[PDB]
Design a protein around this ligand. Structure first.
Ligand SMILES: O=C(O)c1ccccn1
Ligand SMILES: O=C(O)c1ccccn1
Ligand SMILES: O=C(O)c1ccccn1
Ligand SMILES: O=C(O)c1ccccn1
Ligand SMILES: O=C(O)c1ccccn1
Ligand SMILES: [Zn+2]
Ligand SMILES: [Zn+2]
Ligand SMILES: [Zn+2]
Ligand SMILES: [Zn+2]
Ligand SMILES: [Zn+2]
Lengths: 298, 288, 298, 298, 299
């Protein structure tokens, strides 16, 4: 059963049990859903509606332009080198480009700014729960992530349109995320996101007004492997356009990333590096195995 | 024999024959095809190619939406405005290349429309630019393009691609499929095919030119029929008077009292929208 | 000015003028287009339509698989030994293989059979006009071409898909045709076929519902050089997929080919041979000079 | 310091810094000189000699004829409506008139033809360097310039003879060039060409065996203002006849010119138009401000 | 993208700060603005307009038709880029008035023109003082700079743009920037035609009854070190409508020294320092050529 965490149970004497659920999702799933997370359901509903309307208005034509430009009109053999995906990226931190994206509406930009700020505070709240579960001092992960200019925080807004031949192409090929903590607002009707657990692909179930959390490669390093970043993918379907609004809380470019000493006894197998060196490498090898990227930092 | 006019034959000895053919088509056919019209054949090929491919990606799967159907058109369409103001950069489903080509195509058809109106002026004995002046109104002529496809129909005898009507506006410049037929005009009690022809433009005159010419050039009924296989493309540009243009029979063409009304074009168009497939003649009477 | 012959003008006031024009193209161009040839325009439209749709359904992915098979994905330098071409061949005579091309529909197969029979009759009518212009007896060329089983007649169905860098690769390299008379139904929008005349490449202009005629090597031999087989090529372009349905009316395999004695005063420089010996040689050296193939038949 | 670019440094490990100099000149100067290009110094020396000898034999007459019919033999006061300039034009593309200029020698025409071909290839190589610096796809600008008949390429051969009172008249009044890329072989001793930069006229220094490059109005549109076409003029002097062999690589007549979409964020202030409409208008208003010509294309 | 209209009466009250900020925004971003409630009597504007239009009809219109005849502009076969479709005369007020020397004007027109020009000269100096305040300069700075030895130069260009059968062939007045200081225009309130270039588009300066159009010339661009630029403008013709134009030019005296104000120059200026009459002698010959070479020529 996929972990669903009720964050409102942290405000009372059920808080220890909630923390234990968070910790075991972090150790064994790499993913969990959160409900009662404090984000207004009214804000999620308009983010959802304006994301979908901005797709028809602005992204659908770019998407078909892409399928023509790569011959994906007609899928007669398996395509393992492209994602059946429509995306644009919004940067929040350290410097916002929200007011420079030309094709987004005023009210969409205002909703995205509010949504991004609330998710940034929720990311930092979640990192503190991780710290507590890890036996780290409060604020430890936030301070590691800061670097010189503060954390990097952006939002990937994706749609995975219907695919006539889902067997032939993935919406997004299997990978682990490079960063710190990932907070996903996904479609509540159209499924597609899957994680790999114990040798099976497991669906990340659509759930109304929920946020999906998962941990990236940097948290595997800092926890000395105690919390691993898990492989995940998006599969297409013939009917349905799955919406994806995923926010990435990453260390600053010059943050020093290393295994926390209190989590290391035997010499660590994980490297110590500067985050931007990891991200330069990751961009070119995102869909290749994760383990060579750690070795490359030594 | 359907009139085909070679516009390259206007510069010379050949001009009086050509002008006589244009006038004969305007009086008796209401339609004619033009060749050697100055539009680059590469631009037409790109327009045709991108129109057919945009139907593929953006219109065909929505068009998924036993007896004779007399109230629906078997048609997939979207509209582009050029004048007085263009919404070309606001149509969501069009690519940048298609948009750049339509803008170039639209400007050239606008210049050719005004050249054709000047040929009509000469044949009518009107001063050059007379029809363009009449069409201007306050904000200039209205000019837009209707991009249509008529997909194959299993039972073409049950439904028309587009029911019989006359066009409300001024002059219509049609870039139609050069293989798949379908457009027909009504002449002397017979439906006549408007023959597909490579790199040609089909011209026809609308209701506003019938008024201005005091019936000398009438707007002719036409339709699009479906067929069981073939998707006929249609890129049709409508050069119309401005909304507040005053439309009336040109005085030099009226010796009598005219049976045709004098009105403002937008009053004709508001009425036209609701009664497009009913008879033409009541729309003229309604303007008195 | 590229020769366009109106076959309706044989009926026959300008019939001498039409014949003189045919003769002048045969001597000086090696190519000419014919209009009003008797082939139903609706059959041509069906052939063109089904050929283009059969490419998209069956050849376009095979073509992209061949490109990556041969490394033409990257055209960083000139390719002089490959044609940027998708083709299959249909044999009509003496023995048809129309029923063995498996990915074609019964409608396409029935239309190609009707088209091929009409083109075979037009080929023989054209050969009789050449006979008259050359002063040969009626039916002379048909009789020479017959051999024991009759003429060889087949159709090459080609498409030349768009090429990102057309200056690196040809759709089909320069060559002369080995056979008798070639009847080409080519794309009426997309150009590409060129012939060499007076030291210049001249486009063979797309013309709707026209047939392009050219003379092959066997007619150069029979006419003792009076009608030469002309070099031609297909160039690619970056946008546009030129279709080509080209039918080859050739002598039978065991036909004896020699210069017609009434066209020879001075001893001929051309050989006398059996057609299949010429064809066995031609297959290996098609894109090398033509003149050594004549010498090799002595 | 006026930018001088060594093109031979593109073949090696200094190529990035060379590209950076090119991009800097394109953004901030609109002009740059190139050395170590492909042109043989002996070909430049012969072009220069035969241009100067062709002035004395053929153009000096037409120049004094010009001064006669305009009353410019004695300059009492300023002349702001004529250029103190002797010119003839050589067209190379899409069609050459080189063999139709009556008063040009056989060897001048052969040198002029070889020179033009090398400058045409250098124009296209330089346009690809701009593409790379702009982040556009390879060949982007050449493809935009092509239209139906290919680029327009011609050569303006000018001499600016000595002027008794240089204060009264310019060799060529201030203007921006209408076209794409301009490649100038100018006099290496007699100066005169100046550009306007930061509120000062700056000499374009004569330099042995160099080519001066500048960008025209069409590249400002395509780059959405990132590379502007800058005002330039030729001043006269009392002693010295400055030679000018200027080759203009322009889009084809029916080329569609518009800002490249990857260079546009907010709505562009630059129009989208067909090049020949720009040129019709430019011819009559060449020495009036540039900015109204862009406004006229909307 | 609304054309700026400034209510000058709002300077007398609690909204003076907001009004000054609007004026400053128009100076930086438009180079043009319209003013209302400017203090010129509406009845004087009406008489100027009436007498200007009647003086065209009786005295200028015959000359204009005769001007076309002499230049063969009866027949607009092709585009004319070197002639203005314009009927004009000029009135010099300062330093020396020639008003009593124009022969074909009535005494009533001459008296109204003298009164109109005096009020416009006072309004020009009031506006220059608003610019000074917005620029952080001392009160009277621009008037002092403009004075030279004999005071500012002030004249009025009285123009009509008669109907043109083929407007696409010829402009009423070709695109240019004005050479001088501040330009105060009383234009037709019905017939449009004046346009300015802003952000790559021609923008109509909309006719507005009893308004004055203000624009800044090349000299204020120099003095403000480019903070207020002189903007390109033109007059287009139409097939019917005769646009009237009464434009007054408040310019520095001939021997005035023009340079960027020292408090606006934190690093070396791209703008020259010169004497105004040298700029004007050059400008007369190159008025319809680009502006930027004229600044370079003064160095
Ligand atoms: O696009 C991704 O890589 C993604 C999105 C949401 C959650 C995890 N990963
Ligand atoms: O859609 C129409 O009404 C139409 C289209 C093309 C030509 C004439 N009429
Ligand atoms: O493929 C060929 O060699 C060919 C095709 C058509 C016409 C001439 N030659
Ligand atoms: O004659 C010209 O306009 C020119 C010549 C060379 C370089 C730039 N411009
Ligand atoms: O005549 C001019 O140059 C003018 C007239 C009015 C306003 C601005 N400029
Ligand atoms: Zn991911
Ligand atoms: Zn219609
Ligand atoms: Zn061949
Ligand atoms: Zn120039
Ligand atoms: Zn002015």
């Amino acid at each position: 059963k996929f972990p669903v965490v009720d964050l409102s149970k942290l405000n009372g004497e059920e808080r220890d049990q909630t923390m234990a659920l968070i910790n075991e999702a972090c150790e064994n799933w790499g993913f969990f859903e959160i409900v009662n997370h404090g984000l207004p359901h009214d804000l999620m509903d308009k983010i959802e509606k304006m994301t979908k309307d901005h797709y028809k208005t602005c992204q659908e034509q770019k998407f078909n332009d892409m399928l023509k430009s790569k011959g994906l009109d007609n899928l007669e053999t398996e395509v393992e080198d492209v994602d059946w995906e429509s995306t644009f990226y919004v940067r929040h931190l350290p410097q916002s480009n929200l007011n420079d994206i030309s094709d987004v509406s005023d009210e969409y930009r205002t909703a995205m700014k509010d949504f991004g700020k609330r998710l940034e505070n929720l990311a930092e709240d979640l990192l503190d729960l991780l710290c507590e579960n890890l036996g780290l001092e409060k604020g430890y992960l936030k301070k590691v992530f800061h670097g010189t200019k503060g954390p990097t925080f952006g939002t990937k807004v994706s749609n995975y349109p219907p695919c006539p031949k889902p067997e032939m192409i993935k919406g997004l090929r299997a990978h682990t995320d490079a960063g710190g903590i990932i907070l996903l607002f996904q479609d509540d009707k159209v499924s597609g996101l899957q994680l790999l657990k114990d040798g099976d692909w497991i669906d990340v179930p659509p759930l109304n007004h929920s946020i999906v959390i998962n941990l990236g490669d940097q948290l595997e390093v800092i926890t000395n492997g105690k919390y691993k970043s898990v492989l995940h993918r998006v599969v297409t379907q013939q009917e349905g356009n799955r919406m994806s609004v995923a926010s990435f809380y990453n260390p600053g470019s010059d943050a020093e990333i290393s295994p926390a000493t209190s989590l290391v006894e035997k010499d660590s197998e994980y490297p110590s590096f500067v985050f931007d060196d990891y991200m330069k490498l990751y961009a070119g090898v995102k869909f290749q195995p994760k383990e060579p990227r750690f070795a490359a930092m030594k």
